[model samples]
Target: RPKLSTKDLALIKADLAEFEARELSSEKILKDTIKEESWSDLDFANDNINQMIGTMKRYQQEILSIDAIKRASEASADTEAFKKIFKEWSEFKIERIQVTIDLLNGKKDSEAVFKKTYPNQIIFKKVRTNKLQTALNNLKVGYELLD
Candidate 1:
């Protein structure tokens, strides 16, 4: 395996550190929202918040994964090794993103929609058949990506 200089690794580490630091405001937003009664009475307590946390977590992982892929690309790490890991990690992320979209759509079950979205990149059908049911089921949206 080829080795990069300390400077190269440090640069990569610093870049990722900046992204990690931005998660702090995201954390504050979550904490403040939870403090509000709107989150409890209407929202799913902390389910929505937790979902965002999960997304952020997966997003963080995606960011790190991209970083690793870049380094691996530079280092000429085993092409087969990177391909397998990247493919699996990426597929999982796509599914998670769909789950976030469904939850943003007010906790609607989105497994079917998730299966369809990534490979085809098809526009997910915004089903309106159960508008009343969704309204009845969820109280409000307090937790979401870009929330």
Candidate 2:
């Protein structure tokens, strides 16, 4: 992946701040819902759609933690006064790091799920996952980098 310019990083910081503030909504409706006609006891025991929704919600939570860090870093305040802000910022970053590890694990799970669920579905590429991973890698390198 190519490097993120200073301007690019600034924009990302700004965008994530807005996202955390509920200023931005994803145009992509990746959310899925499943409808059922019957609510039998046996049928209620298994729900694939419910699991999918829960997984997606967790993914968004990961993103929100990252946004918290970005917003705190962008805050205009003195270092001393921003001590708590900085601490929470660090915590948020750690949370995001863990979330990223989870995402990668989830990606592996997703690949297995896709393969098993759509084994006969037409050709599929990993473009979306690749882009997502690349973006996260870029941020990780830029933010918590060793000099």
Candidate 3:
């Protein structure tokens, strides 16, 4: 991947902030629906709104985590290592999260989402997880990014 200019990172940060706000709005919608619908209506269970809310919360956490990673990437000595890769990573993760939300809402089937959304790509890797978290660990406690 090529290097990301400071300008590019700034744009990504702004876009991600907007995305986070959208997810928060979605959570509020679900909350309001629960209060408006009676238990007998089964709107929550039938419509899978519960599942969607869970997905939304998890997606919010991951997006915020990724944003923290972005800051760490900024401070990296080899800033070139992050470059364009984080941009694609951020986009792909959000796309997957949205597809999951749609699936929970019955707008898209599981097969449709996984099959259509670049099925071969890896969204989350179980490596070091995050330079941001790892760096914080080393400074605050004394953990290391070991293999």
Backbone clash numbers for all candidates listed: 0, 0, 0
Range of the 10 consecutive residues with the lowest summed lDDT in candidate 2: 24-33
Instruction: Output the number of the TM-score-best candidate.
Output: 3
Cα lDDT tens digits for candidate 1, 88-113: 43344445544553554476667666
Alpha-carbon runs more than 4 Å astray in model 1: 37-68, 71-105, 108-147
Q: How close is candidate 2 to the true structure, as a TM-score?
A: 0.26
- Residue by residue across 27-48, what tens digits does model 3's lDDT show? 5555555455564233544355
Candidate 2 total steric clashes: 0
Pick by lDDT: which candidate is best? 3
Candidate 1 displacement at residue 28 in angstroms? 1.0
The true-versus-predicted C-alpha distance at residue 78 of model 3, in Å, is 8.1
Candidate 2 per-residue lDDT, tens place, 1-147, comes to 223345545644554344333211211111111222345222232243234334444444443444433354454333122224323333333333333333433435644554474454333223322333344453542332110
- The lDDT values for all models are 0.42, 0.35, 0.46
**TM-score between model 3 and native:** 0.35
Ranking by TM-score: 3, 1, 2
Ranking by lDDT: 3, 1, 2
TM-score, per-candidate, Cα-based: 0.32, 0.26, 0.35
Please give the lDDT score for candidate 1: 0.42
Model 2 bad stretches (over 4 Å): 1-48, 65-125, 141-147
